[PDB]
């Protein structure tokens, strides 16, 4: 009704509804629509496209597709049929635009490397470096400086020459790299059940468990090959110092982005539970551990390979033990004075790890100071939600639902009896709760067979849905607003491309503040939003 509730534009498109405006506002034109139809139906053939999209065959297709390529917007799967010839199938590259839709928070990634040049044009220089790379995706040092002016100082333009490596940066597209995960576990899943040295005519089990291992153990160095390889990092040319390989285009990984950004929210987490000085302490403890921490690099085997009520719960234990020991070598044992602005004697003040206690960190090797990591993230993941509803919906809504976390499948008097509020409220807030999941309401027949009035009721949590219903939060404003931005453009569109290509009138001067302050609302708005949105989509 009058479009302002926007029901169509806000009524039936979860998920992809994000993406189509991502590219539309972003790339758009004919280039946009194809991506949605992809994510709509998924698995797709080039010939299969224009049978439906009506995207003006092989013109846009070949154009749009390679457009996606340079920005790696879509999964690229190439293979051959069994009879012969060739066939290709394409999915959406990871979440693709996910890289993009973070954008300036990746500018904040530089704020980690903000050190060594502080409040500089060099800051904005290396910023131009980065954003240019992001825009063009994979870049070579040689082609970059080639495009850049020559005959200047190699270790000056962005000085990032040597700092190209560090922690984040890139990593070349290699085979499986932007190729679908599940798919590449099927391709790599070959060569084992494919290569069977004729053990026994029956019982694949003996052949299975080993080959799975063979699939598992090979997959390790398969995904670690891209993880780090120094034959890039090696180059130490003459009249110069060691650089990565200038020849090859590599590409930003969101790994350092994963931990780096979440770590801030963790500094916020303890920053509640702990004190300011202790807070900043743990904050600086993060600097080294954010390097090798897998973090949301976790899912890995989560997809495409057989799980088990045994081996998934059994083989996942491995993740829980792994970082606590062997990468624990990389992790905190005894560290000395990262920076400091506390002062005077630092050493017993370093025992401040001990104060950090609960319900996280504070697990070490017995008699050195160490923070649990491998299980830290998981026990952390469980914690993250909590206050989400607090002044969102109701103060008391928390404590009861919080209580609903500890207790399980009881009833209302038993709720009325456990804490506080009267029925007029407890019904209200709990009815207010249900008005948005967070319930999974049990019931059992009482003095009836299956019916309503006679029966009795029970209440639980099921954090699955909990750590799951918030994804429409992304659908919430995030795409919708993104519209509300690009919904405004057409208003000033008569001015916009005029005003931009120009660099006049009183009302133009007036509406500049309206649209620009409007921008301050729309984007930094998301800066709030996404910061929240980070959690549930990851572990």
């Amino acid at each position: 009704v009058m479009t302002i509730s926007s029901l169509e534009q806000r009524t039936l498109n979860p998920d992809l509804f994000l993406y189509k405006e991502l590219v539309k506002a972003h790339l758009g034109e004919r280039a946009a629509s194809v991506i949605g139809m992809l994510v709509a139906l998924g698995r797709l053939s080039v010939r299969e496209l224009v049978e439906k999209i009506d995207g003006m065959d092989v013109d846009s297709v070949k154009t749009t597709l390679v457009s996606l390529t340079q920005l790696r917007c879509v999964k690229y799967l190439q293979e051959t049929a069994i009879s012969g010839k060739k066939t290709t199938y394409y999915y959406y590259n990871e979440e693709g635009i996910h890289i993009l839709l973070y954008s300036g928070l990746i500018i904040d990634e530089i704020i980690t490397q903000m050190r060594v040049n502080d409040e500089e044009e060099h800051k904005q220089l290396v910023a131009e470096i980065v954003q240019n790379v992001i825009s063009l995706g994979s870049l070579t040092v040689e082609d970059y400086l080639s495009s850049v002016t020559s005959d200047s100082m190699k270790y000056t333009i962005s000085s990032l020459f040597v700092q190209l490596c560090e922690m984040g940066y890139l990593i070349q597209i290699s085979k499986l790299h932007y190729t679908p995960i599940e798919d590449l576990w099927q391709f790599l899943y070959e060569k084992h059940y494919k290569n069977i040295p004729r053990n026994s005519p029956l019982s694949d089990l003996k052949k299975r468990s080993q080959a799975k291992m063979n699939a598992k153990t090979d997959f390790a160095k398969i995904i670690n090959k891209p993880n780090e390889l120094s034959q890039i990092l090696t180059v130490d040319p003459k009249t110069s110092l060691r650089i990565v390989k200038p020849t090859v285009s590599l590409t930003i990984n969101l790994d350092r982005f994963m931990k780096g950004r979440r770590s801030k929210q963790l500094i916020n987490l303890a920053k509640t539970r702990v004190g300011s000085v202790t807070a900043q302490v743990y904050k600086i403890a993060l600097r080294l551990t954010e390097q090798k921490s897998p973090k949301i690099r976790d899912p890995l085997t989560q997809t495409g390979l057989l799980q088990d009520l045994e081996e998934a719960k059994s083989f996942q234990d491995e993740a829980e033990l792994v970082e606590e020991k062997t990468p624990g070598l990389t992790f905190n044992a005894i560290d000395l004075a990262r920076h400091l602005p506390s002062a005077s004697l630092i050493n017993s003040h370093l025992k401040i790890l001990a104060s950090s206690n609960f319900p996280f960190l504070n697990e070490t090797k017995p008699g050195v100071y160490y923070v649990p990591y491998s299980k830290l993230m998981p026990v952390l993941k469980s914690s993250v939600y909590e206050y989400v509803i607090a002044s969102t919906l109701g103060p008391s809504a928390m404590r009861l639902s919080r209580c609903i976390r500890d207790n399980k499948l009881v009833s209302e008097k038993i709720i009325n009896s456990t804490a506080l509020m009267k029925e007029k409220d407890i019904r209200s807030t709990l009815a207010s709760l249900i008005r948005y999941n967070s319930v999974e309401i049990q019931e059992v027949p009482r003095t009836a067979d299956r019916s309503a009035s006679r029966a009795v009721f029970l209440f639980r949590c099921k954090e699955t849905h909990s750590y799951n219903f918030m994804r429409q939060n992304l659908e919430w404003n995030m795409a919708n607003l993104l519209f509300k931005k690009e919904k405004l453009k057409q208003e000033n569109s008569t001015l916009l491309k005029k005003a931009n290509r120009d660099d006049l009138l009183p009302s133009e001067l007036n509406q500049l503040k309206m649209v620009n302050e409007r921008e301050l609302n729309v984007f930094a708005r998301l800066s709030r939003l996404l910061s929240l949105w980070e959690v549930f989509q990851m572990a």
Partner: protein, 681 residues
Amino acid sequence: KEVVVSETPKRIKGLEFSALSAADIVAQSEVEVSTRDLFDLEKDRAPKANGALDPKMGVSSSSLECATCHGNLASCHGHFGHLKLALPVFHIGYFKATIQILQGICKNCSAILLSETDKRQFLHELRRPGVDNLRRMGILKKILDQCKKQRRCLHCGALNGVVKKAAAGAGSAALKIIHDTFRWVGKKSAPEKDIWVGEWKEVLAHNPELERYVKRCMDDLNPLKTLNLFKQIKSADCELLGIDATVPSGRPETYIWRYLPAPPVCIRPSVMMQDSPASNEDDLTVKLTEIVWTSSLIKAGLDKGISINNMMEHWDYLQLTVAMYINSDSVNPAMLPGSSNGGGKVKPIRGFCQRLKGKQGRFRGNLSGKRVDFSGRTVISPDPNLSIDEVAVPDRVAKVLTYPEKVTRYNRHKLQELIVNGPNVHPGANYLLKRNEDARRNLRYGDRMKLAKNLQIGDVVERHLEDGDVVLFNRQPSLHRLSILSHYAKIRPWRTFRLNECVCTPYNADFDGDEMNLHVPQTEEARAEAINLMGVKNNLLTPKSGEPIIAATQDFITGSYLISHKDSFYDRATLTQLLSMMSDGIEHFDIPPPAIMKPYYLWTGKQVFSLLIKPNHNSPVVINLDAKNKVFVPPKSKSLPNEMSQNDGFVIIRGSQILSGVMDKSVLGDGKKHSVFYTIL
């Protein structure tokens, strides 16, 4: 000015069948029903501001306009209404398929349970161009079943459960659904067994009463639970579950009611006040107009107060109600009643889905069976003197039974005069229509005369049913192809349908006291169609055995026999008046030579009835046929032609004179492939 309007004749091809978006529904209709019925009765009977019945929504009687498109019944085609509904509400129509749409996906992390290339396998299968509506059914069946055998989801790691359609047949839980944690195996322990008994631990620890009493109830899904549950069910499967996701169908989050289309008033009018203050209700109006109530309860209640306990059954009473609202389910499952009840269980509750289901209605008793206009009904009575293929329609219906006509040229002189006779006297018109397509002019007001002089070329006027008009003619118990025929129209006095007898047997008409029905086409092409195709003379043979079904019947049969009879003889005067009586006046003849001469030159019935076939020297019919009549009497077997027996034999005709034998069914009597009439044709 005036942008050129280019409009094109366009005919239907195909029907796209799909669900309704939450958007499109409300995107269309005018008003949220909101309110209640109440008709807010003040200063008026049903002034009804907003409410289930709104003037802008649609009209019932002919009084007030429709607002949106005014002009009352003469205009508005109706408009929907839309409904805000507290909580989602389940659906009875899509129920048993919604089972499946819930089934094939893991109840926890909501992803299609079958995976990898086998997913791709079925996909690539369904995209082979040879897809059939069958292959839709059967193929999607044989991908579906793969669900039930899969114990555990891929990424969630949790087990699954099968939904058995909770309880059975009572209608109360027929909406409710239950899956479980199944194949516990009782020995090998899934971790969710420890988690589950650990769930029951605390109320065990608390109120150790009902737990072990009623138990193993497992879990259900609330329509709310499944609503949000679908909102992680995305893309991917789609047609794997049977739905293409282009746009609107935006994934099977449509199939549960989040908003309710309200039927336009024009569909189901409250029967008018009909002399007095008695105002007849209509069930849909009443039922949904309570659905308002049961909603608004859960609106304002549940906005602050009430209980989880008092909630679900209200909420349940909702889905049960709307369930009934469309369709049947359980009729009287000992519920106890609601508002506007009486508790007598009248019966009269269904009839929206049942509206288009059986007997006389929308199924195939009203629409496929449409009731017809321009017709009449009477009883039967003979006129042999009436030619075959003309019903003689009693003029007294012809006065009121019209035909449309477009005047020009040839027409005027008839029509222009045919008007001035006015409606009452027979050869005339009643309604007249100008070229200006305004409405039409009955002759009631007056005029003609001067108004008849107008008579432009583009003019349309109705006639009575006159000589040489076109009719089709029916008997109700219609067995087959012959159950309709079509005739030219002649007019006579008295009052009844009168036809010629030889076409009785096609109607299987007994005369006696039975009925018929009378139709006339309207457009010209229909006439030329039925008259020159579906009329008599072309249709004369039955399709089944390819015999002429029409023939002499009863008298005419035996009536021939007496003239046919050998022992008879006639006189030149006798034969004269006979041959007259055979064909009224008119047709010339040439007297064949006398049969026998010297004792008075007699003639023979064989000869006269022979002339019946070939009246004249210029008559262009020649026939030779021989055949077996019935009661065939063997000759002496030495005599080769069955022609000569002791009595008759083969009838035989060579050169189109009857040679020998009585006729008597057989030759003219239907019954057999060989027939005099069949041969002539």
